[PDB]
């Protein structure tokens, strides 16, 4: 497996919004790099 | 055209043509004047049928082999090598012709 | 260079049909789809730079495959033999004292081949190398039917090949091959075809032999621009027709074939190599080998072994029968013309 | 090009009726046996009247035996004045994709080698007769090789009955019957001698070891379902163990340095395993479609790559 | 005697050319074009929920 | 001509390096087609076969030698078509046998001793490219070993090629893997030599054929017939229909056990002997 974490500097400037909101973790298998965070985390920085 | 063989390159030319004979009736004649030398020697060279094939052999292999050997032997014609099964019998080659 | 025979002269440039594709594709149009509805040298070396430039603007010629192999010159010589001769490659020779010990019929000498090979390394001293074709005739010269040219091939090889007492190799290498027939490892299990000569580089005891492993013969880069042309030369002991012996005078492409013949008698064994020109396919060839070589079949359970060699693609194939001078000895040499090499595999006939 | 395409030109004669000239364009990719590899032949050197001996028209068994004396060529293109063919024995095309046509009732698959047979089948012995020239063309029938190894086995075995049924096949559930026909004695003895020289040469002293292993097989076939499906309901070794109790020789002459089993198999392969090639001819062509499908149907043309 | 045969008329078609963006289905697409795709290994898209 | 084999995405760091390790190794693709999936090449696509099964399937599929291996697709040049177009392709040895110059090279299923892609969960078994004189010997030894394991010898486990010792032993899986050949080779002989034994005493008809037969059988075959009939005996037997089913079976094993070459090695400006592990310049077109 090669799940490289997403790129926060780029995602700091998004191209377009999502619309629907759902619990995401309910279905994971659509994605590759999937991460949950509680309110903040150290590696973000 | 172009065709390349043996490393050499070969050209060939062709032309289409046509013939119509616009005479009605006999328009030309061939008269045979003289006679150069006859080709075939007018000889005597009788025939063997043992060159040929397709006749039922007479029943005694003692006799059927007997005749053939007493005929085919030494004949100017009769097969030299025993008959090759497939294509044809072949005439003994002559040393020289006249 | 722009002559005035322009009916065929433009066709010798490979043409005007190069624009046949180039006009509606490259010349027109805006489609892919539109909308609807200092005195002598330089110029002496300067035209040599232009010759690189004349070669760089554009990149008929059939293809080859040239091979080179560095070859010790004990048994074969690319030196005495000119361009346009057959060559034959080999395997490693220490497998010879091993395979003869198990492939022999019961009641023969399995230690015969094990000693006969060491007597050739101890006779050519007075390793999958190469054996040229002309060298192989003089060894098997004592088994032929046209023995006079067999005594002419031997007449020059003792005097022209690099080495002392090449006739002592000829009398020993044939003794090796007469041991191959007895020890039942047949020489067609060893001899491999190597293409016709174009060029060769000499040194002490080794040679860099270049040859055509596949393709036509007459247009190879022979190396000499004065003579970039070579024809195929074969001694007349081996060249056996099957057009005359089978009365097939009908025109068509002829096929070239390498043929071994075997003779197994008690200490009287023979070797013969033949190059066979035929109009026969390989599926209809062995029936002719039954006809000519049945005397060796009755007296022996194989009797022959053959392989493909090449095709003369002419409608009328062209042979020659001359006596060339290799050194100082005239050998009756059959010269084949318009020969295209394509090899093939071997065959057993028990 | 000369090594790639070496295209024989059967010349067409001058006077041909349009019922017969349009018969040739219906025969685009079929098989023509060139007698030599000339670049110029005639239709009289191709047709079935060229195929006859002196007064003797060959039967369907002997008609195989003079295919292999000639050069099988696929016709590539039929011009109005000549017919262009590529002989297979040299080399097919530059890139090498020629087209046959299934005159057989049998479909092909990718990778199947194509052996060609004289027109054996019922309702299929189809000879294009050119009545405006009196030339009949027996175009042969291309088949997959598990058929042509079976049909030639049917035709050989039927003639050997006549020295003292068999004529029905199955291929992919299609019952197809071949024509029961008279067979000439000169053709059968060429086939009969071609077996017994090749079978008896395939027997060596190692084969007397293997014949001891026959009652091992009937001991083994009653256990495995594979050998029970291998032998047959109608084999010979199932009867040739119950009459035959062999024993192996204890010592052999120089039996330590020679290999008894190894010498038998190579002597078997080079004489008996080769034998299906000897009676018939060799499949010099197999089918490699590019993009269409895995199966070329009957009547449809089929792309073609040379076969070693 | 006098006889004929005749062609009375001949009829082609017109291939309909259908632009993809004419179809309502193009709603579901977001189409963009790399001029070069083939030089790309795995591409990605980030989301943040 | 060159075909592409698309790698499905989701390849790990070692599995993407695993396809990089097999640069010039042989691949069978079912049909010559421009796009083709990597499941079609894989060992899963062969269904699982034994060594009689793989020799059937190497005669239907079309071999391609892998050229440059890109990270997205695998580029494959087929042998029957694009090797008459592209002249020389490199090919890597995996055999323990050094390839000499100008050798007809066949490919053989790996009987001796196989890259598995874990992220994709499929195995790629590649054949072992060794030349045709060995290919006819090694299979004939391994069949002959299987018969002496059906009741060995001190010999027959050892081959010498080019002065080098080969080891077929290096096993109990191998003898059962190659077992369905052995049950066919034993059947194809013992059915053969009984039909000979049931037809020569049945006819022995003398035109000259029996004169050709019994003179060639003069203490050679008829003594071999009598010594078989001494270890034997001498209703109507279904003889003439047993010929057909044997000829259809005997002619079929000759094509499995042919092991025809595809590759000839015309080296140029290189060694005459390509070692094991190295690449060999490879052609199939004259």
mmCIF file of C-alpha atoms in Angstrom, chain D:
data_model
loop_
_atom_site.group_PDB
_atom_site.id
_atom_site.type_symbol
_atom_site.label_atom_id
_atom_site.label_comp_id
_atom_site.label_asym_id
_atom_site.label_seq_id
_atom_site.Cartn_x
_atom_site.Cartn_y
_atom_site.Cartn_z
ATOM 1 C CA UNK D 1 9.684 -7.503 -50.918
ATOM 2 C CA UNK D 2 11.015 -10.511 -52.855
ATOM 3 C CA UNK D 3 11.536 -12.478 -49.635
ATOM 4 C CA UNK D 4 8.231 -11.209 -48.215
ATOM 5 C CA UNK D 5 5.921 -11.344 -51.231
ATOM 6 C CA UNK D 6 6.767 -13.618 -54.111
ATOM 7 C CA UNK D 7 3.464 -13.509 -55.823
ATOM 8 C CA UNK D 8 2.683 -16.186 -58.392
ATOM 9 C CA UNK D 9 0.483 -15.067 -61.257
ATOM 10 C CA UNK D 10 -1.939 -17.585 -62.634
ATOM 11 C CA UNK D 11 -2.839 -16.051 -65.954
ATOM 12 C CA UNK D 12 -6.502 -16.206 -66.878
ATOM 13 C CA UNK D 13 -7.258 -17.058 -70.536
ATOM 14 C CA UNK D 14 -8.834 -14.692 -73.034
ATOM 15 C CA UNK D 15 -12.388 -15.941 -73.427
ATOM 16 C CA UNK D 16 -14.268 -16.273 -70.145
ATOM 17 C CA UNK D 17 -18.012 -15.853 -69.771
ATOM 18 C CA UNK D 18 -19.233 -13.491 -67.090
ATOM 19 C CA UNK D 19 -20.896 -16.406 -65.267
ATOM 20 C CA UNK D 20 -17.386 -17.810 -64.903
ATOM 21 C CA UNK D 21 -15.412 -14.597 -64.437
ATOM 22 C CA UNK D 22 -17.654 -13.616 -61.547
ATOM 23 C CA UNK D 23 -17.083 -17.083 -60.143
ATOM 24 C CA UNK D 24 -13.434 -16.232 -59.605
ATOM 25 C CA UNK D 25 -14.074 -13.087 -57.603
ATOM 26 C CA UNK D 26 -16.163 -15.231 -55.253
ATOM 27 C CA UNK D 27 -12.958 -17.189 -54.622
ATOM 28 C CA UNK D 28 -10.824 -14.494 -53.044
ATOM 29 C CA UNK D 29 -9.015 -16.294 -50.279
ATOM 30 C CA UNK D 30 -8.852 -19.963 -51.102
ATOM 31 C CA UNK D 31 -6.027 -22.395 -51.550
ATOM 32 C CA UNK D 32 -4.250 -23.141 -54.813
ATOM 33 C CA UNK D 33 -1.453 -25.668 -55.222
ATOM 34 C CA UNK D 34 1.237 -24.232 -57.387
ATOM 35 C CA UNK D 35 3.246 -27.050 -58.954
ATOM 36 C CA UNK D 36 6.465 -25.043 -58.773
ATOM 37 C CA UNK D 37 7.233 -21.555 -57.492
ATOM 38 C CA UNK D 38 7.267 -19.814 -60.840
ATOM 39 C CA UNK D 39 6.151 -16.203 -61.072
ATOM 40 C CA UNK D 40 3.964 -17.096 -64.081
ATOM 41 C CA UNK D 41 1.616 -20.072 -64.265
ATOM 42 C CA UNK D 42 -1.707 -20.773 -65.963
ATOM 43 C CA UNK D 43 -5.094 -22.027 -64.779
ATOM 44 C CA UNK D 44 -4.469 -25.250 -66.664
ATOM 45 C CA UNK D 45 -1.510 -25.769 -64.346
ATOM 46 C CA UNK D 46 -3.676 -25.254 -61.269
ATOM 47 C CA UNK D 47 -7.038 -26.886 -61.942
ATOM 48 C CA UNK D 48 -8.142 -30.412 -61.183
ATOM 49 C CA UNK D 49 -7.332 -31.492 -64.728
ATOM 50 C CA UNK D 50 -3.712 -30.690 -63.888
ATOM 51 C CA UNK D 51 -4.012 -32.884 -60.870
ATOM 52 C CA UNK D 52 -4.814 -36.116 -62.693
ATOM 53 C CA UNK D 53 -2.336 -38.838 -63.600
ATOM 54 C CA UNK D 54 -2.513 -40.619 -66.929
ATOM 55 C CA UNK D 55 -6.181 -41.532 -67.194
ATOM 56 C CA UNK D 56 -6.387 -42.057 -63.425
ATOM 57 C CA UNK D 57 -8.345 -39.557 -61.375
ATOM 58 C CA UNK D 58 -7.192 -39.771 -57.760
ATOM 59 C CA UNK D 59 -9.566 -40.645 -54.961
ATOM 60 C CA UNK D 60 -9.872 -38.526 -51.824
ATOM 61 C CA UNK D 61 -7.136 -40.519 -50.127
ATOM 62 C CA UNK D 62 -4.627 -40.255 -52.954
ATOM 63 C CA UNK D 63 -5.548 -36.635 -53.591
ATOM 64 C CA UNK D 64 -3.797 -35.819 -50.321
ATOM 65 C CA UNK D 65 -0.697 -37.551 -51.561
ATOM 66 C CA UNK D 66 -0.080 -35.041 -54.339
ATOM 67 C CA UNK D 67 -0.943 -31.946 -52.390
ATOM 68 C CA UNK D 68 2.313 -32.457 -50.555
ATOM 69 C CA UNK D 69 4.237 -32.603 -53.822
ATOM 70 C CA UNK D 70 3.060 -29.076 -54.587
ATOM 71 C CA UNK D 71 3.168 -25.659 -52.960
ATOM 72 C CA UNK D 72 0.044 -24.523 -51.129
ATOM 73 C CA UNK D 73 -0.753 -20.930 -51.958
ATOM 74 C CA UNK D 74 -3.486 -18.664 -50.700
ATOM 75 C CA UNK D 75 -4.973 -16.407 -53.341
ATOM 76 C CA UNK D 76 -4.659 -12.787 -52.266
ATOM 77 C CA UNK D 77 -6.320 -10.858 -55.095
ATOM 78 C CA UNK D 78 -8.117 -11.799 -58.322
ATOM 79 C CA UNK D 79 -7.578 -9.279 -61.071
ATOM 80 C CA UNK D 80 -9.660 -9.605 -64.268
ATOM 81 C CA UNK D 81 -6.702 -10.933 -66.282
ATOM 82 C CA UNK D 82 -4.724 -12.855 -63.669
ATOM 83 C CA UNK D 83 -4.968 -14.342 -60.196
ATOM 84 C CA UNK D 84 -2.367 -13.419 -57.585
ATOM 85 C CA UNK D 85 -1.324 -15.925 -54.922
ATOM 86 C CA UNK D 86 1.125 -16.067 -52.039
ATOM 87 C CA UNK D 87 2.946 -19.379 -51.575
ATOM 88 C CA UNK D 88 3.106 -20.328 -47.930
ATOM 89 C CA UNK D 89 6.386 -22.251 -48.181
ATOM 90 C CA UNK D 90 8.429 -19.091 -48.720
ATOM 91 C CA UNK D 91 6.837 -16.404 -46.603
ATOM 92 C CA UNK D 92 3.395 -14.984 -46.407
ATOM 93 C CA UNK D 93 3.414 -11.171 -46.618
ATOM 94 C CA UNK D 94 5.571 -8.321 -45.313
ATOM 95 C CA UNK D 95 3.676 -7.873 -42.067
ATOM 96 C CA UNK D 96 2.165 -11.298 -42.629
ATOM 97 C CA UNK D 97 -1.618 -11.243 -42.486
ATOM 98 C CA UNK D 98 -3.289 -13.080 -45.339
ATOM 99 C CA UNK D 99 -6.886 -14.261 -45.488
ATOM 100 C CA UNK D 100 -8.309 -17.712 -45.968
ATOM 101 C CA UNK D 101 -12.005 -18.464 -46.213
ATOM 102 C CA UNK D 102 -13.782 -21.233 -44.367
ATOM 103 C CA UNK D 103 -15.280 -23.555 -46.914
ATOM 104 C CA UNK D 104 -15.521 -26.022 -44.050
ATOM 105 C CA UNK D 105 -18.640 -26.360 -41.931
ATOM 106 C CA UNK D 106 -16.376 -26.003 -38.895
ATOM 107 C CA UNK D 107 -15.517 -22.835 -37.017
ATOM 108 C CA UNK D 108 -11.977 -21.946 -36.018
ATOM 109 C CA UNK D 109 -10.444 -20.407 -32.929
ATOM 110 C CA UNK D 110 -7.500 -18.108 -32.334
ATOM 111 C CA UNK D 111 -4.226 -19.948 -32.267
ATOM 112 C CA UNK D 112 -5.619 -22.995 -34.060
ATOM 113 C CA UNK D 113 -3.316 -24.258 -36.804
ATOM 114 C CA UNK D 114 -5.033 -24.822 -40.109
ATOM 115 C CA UNK D 115 -4.544 -28.079 -41.979
ATOM 116 C CA UNK D 116 -6.183 -28.308 -45.375
ATOM 117 C CA UNK D 117 -7.941 -31.420 -46.655
ATOM 118 C CA UNK D 118 -9.436 -32.387 -50.054
ATOM 119 C CA UNK D 119 -13.218 -31.947 -50.124
ATOM 120 C CA UNK D 120 -14.211 -35.007 -48.113
ATOM 121 C CA UNK D 121 -17.551 -34.011 -46.556
ATOM 122 C CA UNK D 122 -21.093 -34.731 -47.694
ATOM 123 C CA UNK D 123 -22.808 -31.907 -49.536
ATOM 124 C CA UNK D 124 -19.468 -30.133 -49.625
ATOM 125 C CA UNK D 125 -17.456 -31.620 -52.530
ATOM 126 C CA UNK D 126 -17.847 -28.278 -54.255
ATOM 127 C CA UNK D 127 -15.834 -27.810 -57.427
ATOM 128 C CA UNK D 128 -16.081 -24.506 -59.239
ATOM 129 C CA UNK D 129 -16.493 -25.655 -62.828
ATOM 130 C CA UNK D 130 -15.603 -23.111 -65.493
ATOM 131 C CA UNK D 131 -17.840 -24.329 -68.307
ATOM 132 C CA UNK D 132 -16.602 -21.644 -70.695
ATOM 133 C CA UNK D 133 -13.116 -23.178 -70.449
ATOM 134 C CA UNK D 134 -13.742 -26.729 -69.149
ATOM 135 C CA UNK D 135 -11.689 -26.255 -65.992
ATOM 136 C CA UNK D 136 -12.852 -27.571 -62.642
ATOM 137 C CA UNK D 137 -11.063 -26.201 -59.576
ATOM 138 C CA UNK D 138 -10.996 -28.416 -56.504
ATOM 139 C CA UNK D 139 -10.355 -25.855 -53.878
ATOM 140 C CA UNK D 140 -9.430 -27.745 -50.711
ATOM 141 C CA UNK D 141 -11.149 -27.547 -47.342
ATOM 142 C CA UNK D 142 -9.277 -25.830 -44.493
ATOM 143 C CA UNK D 143 -9.754 -27.453 -41.102
ATOM 144 C CA UNK D 144 -8.415 -27.247 -37.564
ATOM 145 C CA UNK D 145 -5.708 -29.808 -36.928
ATOM 146 C CA UNK D 146 -7.641 -31.945 -34.391
ATOM 147 C CA UNK D 147 -9.970 -32.591 -37.303
ATOM 148 C CA UNK D 148 -7.422 -33.343 -40.011
ATOM 149 C CA UNK D 149 -5.538 -35.723 -37.759
ATOM 150 C CA UNK D 150 -8.850 -37.521 -37.225
ATOM 151 C CA UNK D 151 -10.188 -37.548 -40.781
ATOM 152 C CA UNK D 152 -6.941 -38.878 -42.258
ATOM 153 C CA UNK D 153 -7.124 -41.545 -39.580
ATOM 154 C CA UNK D 154 -10.643 -42.344 -40.757
ATOM 155 C CA UNK D 155 -9.632 -42.591 -44.393
ATOM 156 C CA UNK D 156 -6.539 -44.718 -43.781
ATOM 157 C CA UNK D 157 -8.334 -47.157 -41.489
ATOM 158 C CA UNK D 158 -11.218 -47.594 -43.902
ATOM 159 C CA UNK D 159 -8.978 -48.757 -46.732
ATOM 160 C CA UNK D 160 -7.310 -51.339 -44.516
ATOM 161 C CA UNK D 161 -10.752 -52.841 -43.940
ATOM 162 C CA UNK D 162 -10.824 -53.489 -47.672
ATOM 163 C CA UNK D 163 -7.852 -55.858 -47.578
ATOM 164 C CA UNK D 164 -9.857 -58.621 -45.921
ATOM 165 C CA UNK D 165 -19.203 -47.863 -39.072
ATOM 166 C CA UNK D 166 -16.278 -45.503 -39.363
ATOM 167 C CA UNK D 167 -17.445 -42.480 -41.375
ATOM 168 C CA UNK D 168 -19.071 -40.229 -38.735
ATOM 169 C CA UNK D 169 -17.367 -37.549 -36.647
ATOM 170 C CA UNK D 170 -18.313 -34.996 -34.035
ATOM 171 C CA UNK D 171 -16.796 -31.570 -33.626
ATOM 172 C CA UNK D 172 -18.262 -29.274 -30.959
ATOM 173 C CA UNK D 173 -21.508 -31.222 -31.000
ATOM 174 C CA UNK D 174 -21.900 -30.981 -34.759
ATOM 175 C CA UNK D 175 -22.432 -34.410 -36.247
ATOM 176 C CA UNK D 176 -20.693 -34.263 -39.585
ATOM 177 C CA UNK D 177 -20.346 -37.216 -41.913
ATOM 178 C CA UNK D 178 -17.645 -37.697 -44.487
ATOM 179 C CA UNK D 179 -18.274 -39.283 -47.860
ATOM 180 C CA UNK D 180 -17.865 -43.039 -47.952
ATOM 181 C CA UNK D 181 -16.070 -43.517 -51.235
ATOM 182 C CA UNK D 182 -14.122 -46.106 -53.195
ATOM 183 C CA UNK D 183 -10.387 -46.138 -52.557
ATOM 184 C CA UNK D 184 -7.671 -47.212 -54.951
ATOM 185 C CA UNK D 185 -5.123 -49.849 -54.050
ATOM 186 C CA UNK D 186 -2.039 -47.894 -55.146
ATOM 187 C CA UNK D 187 -2.877 -45.051 -52.794
ATOM 188 C CA UNK D 188 -3.546 -47.277 -49.783
ATOM 189 C CA UNK D 189 -0.293 -49.230 -50.051
ATOM 190 C CA UNK D 190 1.599 -45.953 -49.935
ATOM 191 C CA UNK D 191 -0.271 -45.189 -46.734
ATOM 192 C CA UNK D 192 0.035 -48.723 -45.382
ATOM 193 C CA UNK D 193 3.788 -48.863 -45.900
ATOM 194 C CA UNK D 194 4.120 -45.432 -44.311
ATOM 195 C CA UNK D 195 2.740 -46.799 -41.046
ATOM 196 C CA UNK D 196 4.649 -50.017 -40.653
ATOM 197 C CA UNK D 197 8.043 -48.572 -41.510
ATOM 198 C CA UNK D 198 7.380 -45.846 -38.967
ATOM 199 C CA UNK D 199 5.765 -47.954 -36.252
ATOM 200 C CA UNK D 200 8.304 -50.789 -36.242
ATOM 201 C CA UNK D 201 11.104 -48.233 -36.192
ATOM 202 C CA UNK D 202 9.462 -46.860 -33.060
ATOM 203 C CA UNK D 203 10.158 -50.100 -31.140
ATOM 204 C CA UNK D 204 13.430 -50.465 -29.226
ATOM 205 C CA UNK D 205 14.711 -52.713 -26.421
ATOM 206 C CA UNK D 206 13.459 -50.239 -23.835
ATOM 207 C CA UNK D 207 9.870 -50.947 -24.909
ATOM 208 C CA UNK D 208 9.983 -54.344 -23.244
ATOM 209 C CA UNK D 209 10.245 -52.535 -19.918
ATOM 210 C CA UNK D 210 7.117 -50.504 -20.610
ATOM 211 C CA UNK D 211 5.077 -53.549 -21.609
ATOM 212 C CA UNK D 212 5.596 -54.863 -18.075
ATOM 213 C CA UNK D 213 3.735 -51.801 -16.835
ATOM 214 C CA UNK D 214 0.459 -52.750 -18.559
ATOM 215 C CA UNK D 215 -1.123 -54.574 -15.570
ATOM 216 C CA UNK D 216 -0.050 -51.615 -13.500
ATOM 217 C CA UNK D 217 -2.332 -49.503 -15.696
ATOM 218 C CA UNK D 218 -5.470 -51.589 -15.274
ATOM 219 C CA UNK D 219 -4.571 -51.639 -11.603
ATOM 220 C CA UNK D 220 -4.357 -47.861 -11.765
ATOM 221 C CA UNK D 221 -7.293 -47.094 -14.055
ATOM 222 C CA UNK D 222 -9.834 -48.659 -11.710
ATOM 223 C CA UNK D 223 -8.784 -46.153 -9.042
ATOM 224 C CA UNK D 224 -8.223 -42.855 -10.843
ATOM 225 C CA UNK D 225 -11.082 -41.411 -12.802
ATOM 226 C CA UNK D 226 -8.602 -39.762 -15.142
ATOM 227 C CA UNK D 227 -6.943 -42.907 -16.450
ATOM 228 C CA UNK D 228 -10.407 -44.490 -16.498
ATOM 229 C CA UNK D 229 -11.305 -41.614 -18.784
ATOM 230 C CA UNK D 230 -7.982 -41.918 -20.595
ATOM 231 C CA UNK D 231 -7.777 -45.514 -21.779
ATOM 232 C CA UNK D 232 -11.207 -45.877 -23.326
ATOM 233 C CA UNK D 233 -14.231 -48.089 -23.429
ATOM 234 C CA UNK D 234 -12.724 -49.475 -26.666
ATOM 235 C CA UNK D 235 -8.967 -49.742 -26.225
ATOM 236 C CA UNK D 236 -6.583 -52.630 -26.799
ATOM 237 C CA UNK D 237 -4.394 -52.518 -23.673
ATOM 238 C CA UNK D 238 -7.475 -53.335 -21.609
ATOM 239 C CA UNK D 239 -7.533 -56.653 -23.464
ATOM 240 C CA UNK D 240 -3.771 -56.974 -23.930
ATOM 241 C CA UNK D 241 -3.060 -57.432 -20.232
ATOM 242 C CA UNK D 242 -5.519 -60.261 -19.620
ATOM 243 C CA UNK D 243 -3.908 -62.380 -22.353
ATOM 244 C CA UNK D 244 -0.386 -61.090 -21.822
ATOM 245 C CA UNK D 245 1.784 -61.740 -18.757
ATOM 246 C CA UNK D 246 5.214 -60.327 -19.656
ATOM 247 C CA UNK D 247 8.428 -60.390 -17.671
ATOM 248 C CA UNK D 248 11.416 -58.087 -17.946
ATOM 249 C CA UNK D 249 14.957 -59.342 -18.574
ATOM 250 C CA UNK D 250 17.054 -59.227 -15.432
ATOM 251 C CA UNK D 251 20.387 -58.146 -16.923
ATOM 252 C CA UNK D 252 21.049 -56.218 -20.109
ATOM 253 C CA UNK D 253 24.051 -56.001 -22.402
ATOM 254 C CA UNK D 254 26.019 -52.995 -21.083
ATOM 255 C CA UNK D 255 22.930 -52.193 -19.009
ATOM 256 C CA UNK D 256 24.733 -49.792 -16.664
ATOM 257 C CA UNK D 257 26.019 -47.169 -19.120
ATOM 258 C CA UNK D 258 22.970 -47.010 -21.419
ATOM 259 C CA UNK D 259 19.518 -45.744 -20.553
ATOM 260 C CA UNK D 260 16.722 -48.145 -21.537
ATOM 261 C CA UNK D 261 13.734 -45.852 -21.028
ATOM 262 C CA UNK D 262 15.372 -42.751 -22.460
ATOM 263 C CA UNK D 263 16.281 -44.348 -25.771
ATOM 264 C CA UNK D 264 12.746 -45.613 -26.324
ATOM 265 C CA UNK D 265 10.938 -42.278 -26.081
ATOM 266 C CA UNK D 266 13.131 -40.439 -28.566
ATOM 267 C CA UNK D 267 12.883 -43.385 -30.927
ATOM 268 C CA UNK D 268 9.145 -43.220 -30.355
ATOM 269 C CA UNK D 269 8.747 -39.474 -30.954
ATOM 270 C CA UNK D 270 10.865 -39.345 -34.085
ATOM 271 C CA UNK D 271 8.935 -42.189 -35.721
ATOM 272 C CA UNK D 272 5.466 -42.597 -34.199
ATOM 273 C CA UNK D 273 4.789 -39.161 -32.745
ATOM 274 C CA UNK D 274 5.764 -37.692 -36.103
ATOM 275 C CA UNK D 275 3.432 -39.988 -37.997
ATOM 276 C CA UNK D 276 0.340 -37.783 -38.206
ATOM 277 C CA UNK D 277 2.479 -35.383 -40.210
ATOM 278 C CA UNK D 278 3.651 -38.179 -42.511
ATOM 279 C CA UNK D 279 0.290 -39.390 -43.822
ATOM 280 C CA UNK D 280 -1.268 -35.917 -44.133
ATOM 281 C CA UNK D 281 0.479 -32.618 -44.757
ATOM 282 C CA UNK D 282 1.792 -30.076 -42.219
ATOM 283 C CA UNK D 283 -0.226 -27.160 -40.823
ATOM 284 C CA UNK D 284 1.915 -24.288 -42.055
ATOM 285 C CA UNK D 285 -0.644 -21.639 -41.028
ATOM 286 C CA UNK D 286 -2.390 -20.638 -37.847
ATOM 287 C CA UNK D 287 -5.071 -18.081 -37.184
ATOM 288 C CA UNK D 288 -4.316 -14.868 -35.295
ATOM 289 C CA UNK D 289 -7.207 -12.442 -35.392
ATOM 290 C CA UNK D 290 -6.328 -9.018 -34.066
ATOM 291 C CA UNK D 291 -9.447 -7.387 -32.741
ATOM 292 C CA UNK D 292 -12.566 -9.149 -33.979
ATOM 293 C CA UNK D 293 -13.243 -12.212 -31.867
ATOM 294 C CA UNK D 294 -11.900 -15.512 -30.695
ATOM 295 C CA UNK D 295 -13.833 -17.481 -33.332
ATOM 296 C CA UNK D 296 -13.841 -17.099 -37.098
ATOM 297 C CA UNK D 297 -17.129 -18.497 -38.322
ATOM 298 C CA UNK D 298 -17.837 -20.557 -41.410
ATOM 299 C CA UNK D 299 -17.706 -18.639 -44.660
ATOM 300 C CA UNK D 300 -15.978 -15.660 -43.044
ATOM 301 C CA UNK D 301 -12.400 -14.790 -43.866
ATOM 302 C CA UNK D 302 -9.728 -15.382 -41.279
ATOM 303 C CA UNK D 303 -6.472 -13.529 -40.614
ATOM 304 C CA UNK D 304 -3.372 -15.642 -40.920
ATOM 305 C CA UNK D 305 0.105 -15.794 -39.420
ATOM 306 C CA UNK D 306 2.794 -18.305 -40.406
ATOM 307 C CA UNK D 307 3.266 -21.299 -38.193
ATOM 308 C CA UNK D 308 6.572 -22.984 -37.242
#
